[PDB]
């Protein structure tokens, strides 16, 4: 829905494997307009 309404914003997913979330975690080392997350993480 971030893509459908106004796609301009820099959106980060944050789900799945430790390796995949680690790859994204290092991006926020601003161009991170939202991160999409869940409470267990």
């Amino acid at each position: 829905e971030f893509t459908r309404f106004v796609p301009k914003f820099k959106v980060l997913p944050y789900w799945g494997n430790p390796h995949d979330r680690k790859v994204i975690r290092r991006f926020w080392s601003a161009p991170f307009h939202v991160v999409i997350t869940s409470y267990q993480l």
Binding site: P13, D20, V23, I24, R26, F27
Partner: peptide, 29 residues
């Protein structure tokens, strides 16, 4: 003498961001 150290600096400076961004573009779909 520093140029051989500088060419190593610029190629790794692009390779760093390149691989991370390439993985980002493969990931998000």
């Amino acid at each position: 003498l520093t140029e051989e150290m500088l060419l190593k600096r610029e190629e790794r400076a692009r390779k760093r961001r390149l691989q991370a961004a390439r993985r980002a573009e493969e990931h998000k779909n």
